[PDB]
Ligand binder design. Sequence first.
Ligand SMILES: [Mg+2]
Ligand SMILES: [Zn+2]
Ligand SMILES: [Zn+2]
Ligand SMILES: [Zn+2]
Lengths: 49, 1345, 72, 247, 102, 75
Amino acid sequence: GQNMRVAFMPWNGYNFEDSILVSERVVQEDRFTTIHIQELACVSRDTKL
Amino acid sequence: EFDAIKIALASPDMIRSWSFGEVKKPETINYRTFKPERDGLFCARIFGPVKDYECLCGKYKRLKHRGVICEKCGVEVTQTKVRRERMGHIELASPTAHIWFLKSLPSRIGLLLDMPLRDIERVLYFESYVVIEGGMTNLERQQILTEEQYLDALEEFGDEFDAKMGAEAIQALLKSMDLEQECEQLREELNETNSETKRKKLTKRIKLLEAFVQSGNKPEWMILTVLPVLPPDLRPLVPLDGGRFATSDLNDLYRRVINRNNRLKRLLDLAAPDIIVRNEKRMLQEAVDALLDNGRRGRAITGSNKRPLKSLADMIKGKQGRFRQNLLGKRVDYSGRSVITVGPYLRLHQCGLPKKMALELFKPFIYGKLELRGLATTIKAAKKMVEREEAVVWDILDEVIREHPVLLNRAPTLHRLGIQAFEPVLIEGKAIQLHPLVCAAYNADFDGDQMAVHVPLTLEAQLEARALMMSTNNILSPANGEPIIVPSQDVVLGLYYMTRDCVNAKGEGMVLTGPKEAERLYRSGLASLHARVKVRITEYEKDANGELVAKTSLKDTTVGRAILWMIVPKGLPYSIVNQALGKKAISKMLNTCYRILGLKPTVIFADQIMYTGFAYAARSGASVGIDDMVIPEKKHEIISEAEAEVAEIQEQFQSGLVTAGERYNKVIDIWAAANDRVSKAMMDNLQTETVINRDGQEEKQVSFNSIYMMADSGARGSAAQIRQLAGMRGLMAKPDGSIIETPITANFREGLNVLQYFISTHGARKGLADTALKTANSGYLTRRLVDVAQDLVVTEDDCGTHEGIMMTPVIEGGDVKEPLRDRVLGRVTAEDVLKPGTADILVPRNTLLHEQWCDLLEENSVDAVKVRSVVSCDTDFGVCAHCYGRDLARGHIINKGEAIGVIAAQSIGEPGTQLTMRTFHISSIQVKNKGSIKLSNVKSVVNSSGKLVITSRNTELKLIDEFGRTKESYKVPYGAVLAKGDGEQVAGGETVANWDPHTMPVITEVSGFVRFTDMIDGQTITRQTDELTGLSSLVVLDSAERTAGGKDLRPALKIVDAQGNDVLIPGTDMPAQYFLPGKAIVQLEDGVQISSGDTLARIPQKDITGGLPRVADLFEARRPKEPAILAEISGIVSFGKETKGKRRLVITPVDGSDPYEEMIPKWRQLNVFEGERVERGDVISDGPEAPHDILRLRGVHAVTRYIVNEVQDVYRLQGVKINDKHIEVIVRQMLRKATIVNAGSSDFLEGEQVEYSRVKIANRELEANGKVGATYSRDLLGITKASLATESFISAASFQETTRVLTEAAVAGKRDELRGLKENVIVGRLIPAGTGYAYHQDRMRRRAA
Amino acid sequence: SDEADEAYSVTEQLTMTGINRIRQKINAHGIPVYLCEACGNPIPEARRKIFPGVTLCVECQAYQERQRKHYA
Amino acid sequence: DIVLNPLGVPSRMNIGQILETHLGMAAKGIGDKINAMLKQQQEVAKLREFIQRAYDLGADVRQKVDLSTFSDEEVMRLAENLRKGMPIATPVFDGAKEAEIKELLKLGDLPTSGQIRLYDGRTGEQFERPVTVGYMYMLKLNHLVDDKMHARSTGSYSLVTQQPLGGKAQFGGQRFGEMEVWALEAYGAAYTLQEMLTVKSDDVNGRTKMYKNIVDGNHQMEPGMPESFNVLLKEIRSLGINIELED
Amino acid sequence: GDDEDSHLGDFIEDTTLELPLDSATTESLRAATHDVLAGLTAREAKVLRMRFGIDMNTDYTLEEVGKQFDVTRERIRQIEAKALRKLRHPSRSEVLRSFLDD
Amino acid sequence: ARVTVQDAVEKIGNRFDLVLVAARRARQMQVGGKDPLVPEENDKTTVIALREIEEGLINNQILDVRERQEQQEQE
Ligand SMILES: [Mg+2]
Ligand SMILES: [Zn+2]
Ligand SMILES: [Zn+2]
Ligand SMILES: [Zn+2]
């Protein structure tokens, strides 16, 4: 993970049941960006036509 | 379009008329050019073309040749959809019995001919022969012979006798048989003969014959002479990736039938050796049965990949079949799915819908609106624009979205509030923002849960999301009127922090001129949210006729309550906000806002409450720290005392003073007491510990501990969980209930060492695994109750009856548990209810008792009110609008077309999710308050002693004060020594009666000498020696050890005068003697006195289940194992032959069938005397009551009251609340069956179980006539058998054994008039329940014009 | 709520009913017998003082405890 | 950086999370001091002194570390890697006791109560009742919303049972199961149910006919009969059971 | 190997069905061509509906069109070429052409 | 928009009669030709027909007699 500076407090309902109210410096500083490597594939089979 | 679904057998001519051509070869396709081979299992000549409007060769491809049958390959040029409806037929060269009609158990073939099953299957496989009208020589019609028997028959009986073999013989047998002739013979055997069970089975066969005649079926159609093959596009053979095809197993099964059929044709035209021909016929029969229902005669074949090939029967039946998994619930377009987040800014009717998730759901509407506004020339330009997300598409989308609701639905939709309609709000993101207040409805939090979105497309479907399924119309739970818009956890804590007070805060004690000034003081920073203060508030009251009379005054409130008062709507009082506002109080405030101001003010109050709660919770900064779990410093000395007592017990165990189990129990008791002590210490340290100064020294108030605030406000917590954080964790438990004696004396604030943690993991994993099932088998009770109680619909505004239930408070034990206002609120009365002095005509008959009439009822302290119930409603095929009362949620009165059955099942099953998945178990009256005595079964005598004694059996005594209301109820035994007797109004601190379980008296009527008549010791009495008092006792016993000479004889105690005459029992001329059964010690002598009910014979010496199984069993209506036998008839009782397990209990009525008698299990403690007049509908031995017993004895209201009270016991045990309308509906479906006692002028069988509604209507229309109706007797079934009997075979095949249902329908030739909720859904029509109920009424009016 | 949040109520009911039945097994009232109801011997002052309202001597209690241990 | 609900601690009895908030605040407070010392350059002596204080700091522990066996530039690599906060070990049932946490807080210049006063970002005012603020280690599970979110209006359909199939993982619509049918029978929503099981799912003509009506500005359907029921009729009739539809 | 006890027969898609965007992209084309043909004399309109299969049964050859018009095939070819020329220009081509995403 | 249909319920009684009567009127306006009896606030046909039902000037008897009048004048 990442060690984030969390404050335990309500703040206007934006963490109501178990939501998390994350600041915009956390997505600015890119400390939860992840890299995801999909693989697509194109097979050229031999149809009757 | 189409009326009912007709069903029957299939004539071979009808099966040849279905088909579009025979199937002669087992060829699917060619292996190089994958065109259908023939004249095979995939054929273009039979099953239409394999490409649209295209012949097979290619000679005809244009549309102009539409319909042509091509000259070359005879392939009719038409659509390829045609390949999905045309059927073929295989022509079985030999007959072949339908396995459905040979293993249906009873075998329809078998029970039609009256030939037992093994004989049929022995003639079937050529094991034997069966004669078929074997001439006028020797034999019976269905006389089966062995092989050599037939061989010798052909010698001595050459011709004029014909016995066949195999399915050909069964075909000839069914064919030659004439149904009316045999039916006559059955008439003669049924009415000229009396052998009860033989005639039961006889009449069953008779009914089957009459059904086979009523229908158009012919018995010889149960033998498949012609076999139809499914259309190819239902059993397709599809090209996969790599050229390896994919086929449904039906192609394998059709191929195996076709090869064997062709080989049988071959062998037949070779004159082959007839044993080989027998084998071919047998194999073909087995193949046809694997094709029709595999694994129904032998072992499933096979399959090719070692798994049982599925056949057509498997295609219908099974949980993974066709009636269930794509017929009732299917996949759906115009729907999405996303992670839900919260978004507290939404209004209660709207939800955030991602732009990306909305541009895909409304693409049709967006294309239409683009092409309409001219922004795009055509649908293709529109599609391109949306595909590149032009700038204008977001305006077009905001216009499509505006009034268009969408259905939001969570996964386990337990109750109907799980599919709610919202208006969308195009939000940026990829997560649905769901309004906080709804999450209690959905039972949904934001730990990653997801929801599905659907678009109600059509006009009539998108006014139902607006008028029925919308989020704002649904604020009340249908299981109980309480609003489910309860603010849950941040809101109740914001409101708790707001509306509270501190002993001395900034700006305490300053007069304010209104809520506005309080808010301006708080925002300015000059006065705290809880500072005691006086504010002039003006509250309104609409007890006037709609008018709100105002009133202003200087309330002594705080700044928090002041600021909160601005939010409250007009007509509410100020006491609603002038307490500390927990969670319970917070939802009571909403309930009062509803019950005063209707729906719209409450809907606005909800989100106002929510916004202001979140705002002030955030203002409060209420965090939680590790110092907020203040452990009490008295915990160590309490634990030292506990360890000391435990060491004391260990020493007393090593000393030889207690067993091992006793030391275990004493240790657990010590540790439990110590845990309660430490928790009380930590709570006393937590709750009040805040100590402050007001003008001087000091003062304590309710603590501001953050964790205590969460525990007390009701947001989150209890005493148990805070105790585990602060006190001790107490004793863990192993999974099987085995409580560990080593208690975790630590909390989570301080550490937990390794051993305590490992101990706790036991119960932890048991709880986890248990909720891993209770989630998996989530809604099985709602499913079982939507099966039995589905097709009820409120279909009439009034049936106009006068029958109901005498609803009263459940005043059990002490004070009531459920008052009258809970249980009579919302139901229409059955009869005009007057005051106790009657004073007026208080409440009319058909007035819906809303809140005002309940006010009226508990001003006058009305105790019993008759209120109409749904189990007594006289409607036909439904329930009147008034015999259901007020409907929750919507809260006015149920309008005809409510599907009250589905709602009743869902309301009994969503609450049941909150119950335990396991079934778990659990001198002088301390009478409580002042009041008067109340007698039921008043037969008491005042002894010479002066106190009272119940000379009756079941005298029930109640303490009833000057209120008119009953305040205490009690069951009094047979003649306890009552300190207080009859009608004696007394107060608290005065016991109503003393008794003793070692003392059950046999008190008499009069005073006098107790002579001993009919008493000779050695045969009925026992020699109990008075080593305790210094006398002799002859105690009454039965024939258990005394010989049989005088064993049945009872020891009679003759209560007579001083002269010797038999003093009668006052009331009956039988004198005052008593015949005594055992268990009552006699301390008298012969020729001895007793006072007015002196001690003649003295008899010496609460667990409740609560699991959801205790509701599935309460509804399933089974029989307990200690079944309290009741009093079947009134009159007197006699005891007869004993020592058998059934001692004769004769009941001689007053004027009825006097020799009536029953059996008694003499292992039981029989608790009634033989001289007392038995009352019908009364208990004899004491134990759990049986439902069927009550239903036969006391009436339908008796069984309904019992079932309702038991289910309400198990529901109130866990605090879970559910109304009783729903259980009354489940019962009304439960006792749906009548039974014919007397045939009468009616036209049902003698002892036939018929639908009670049927007998009701028939005998009612006869009562209108001059003929005597049928005297019915109401049955009582379990839900899984009250659902088994359903009129429409579609629904029955849906939720039952499908093969049994379709076989019964096929033979009977039933016609399914689609008039049930579960049938119409299957056939795609409107359910005749809600919005489509008017449509179905118009359909019923069109039919029979 | 989460699967760990109703599992708590399950475990809570479980330990609660367990402790309840066990501390109901104990006897707190007083009906001084002074003699066992199985072997007739006087229940001594010590044992009858630990458990008020004890109804059986030590060894009869052990016997019945074992017998019920087999569930017979 | 992150704001978490306080109410999830009492109900869900995991005091570990607030204890770790406190200890992380301590561990970042011992890193802030090192960072300040490293930017207003003092010298390796005083920096070494403070790190040696922070490294002993407890009861009898087996973490005997002494910064005298460290080359002066071996203390600046360490002093750089402790700039963003010092790590802290805490074996499972052998952890740091609360007194150790308070002492490590006091060694930094944080409040011993583990709690700070905080001001609203918007109104600039001060929250009453100081709040827990600390550095907590937060993981990002791969229940990413970029995979959970999907939607469909009209896509592919299965070949045998002509229902929405999809296959874009997953362009198939949502499964309107049985409990949802009961939920819509509970309301009187007959039209919603009907379109939800014939026009949006099964009926092959009604759906292509309604996609035209939606585009034509006409919101109204002709439902017809589901191909599930047509298939069921064909299969029952493909037994010996003649099942027909009485007009 | 799925959660719903799914089978291989549930994922076999359908390659013959025409998507309802591709039926509403054919009815739109029928309406567009009926419009653009209405902007024309009965000569061109009738001869084009007859030469092609537009709103009619089997498209006839040139000789059948001529027998319906009592004129020889080359006149029919000239007429249809005239009409297609007239339709090729914008004001008669903009609406049809948008049906061509090529 | 329209948050509650509580007022429209009292004008028609049944909550299903209301839906079937309002869908009828809103389809009259949608397809088509007929006009709203109330100043449309940039609403859709559904909420327009609901709001007209709120004001008592739309219901089953009124809509049916409006049917009869045009059936007459269609001749
Ligand atoms: Mg969850
Ligand atoms: Zn051909
Ligand atoms: Zn009724
Ligand atoms: Zn003993």
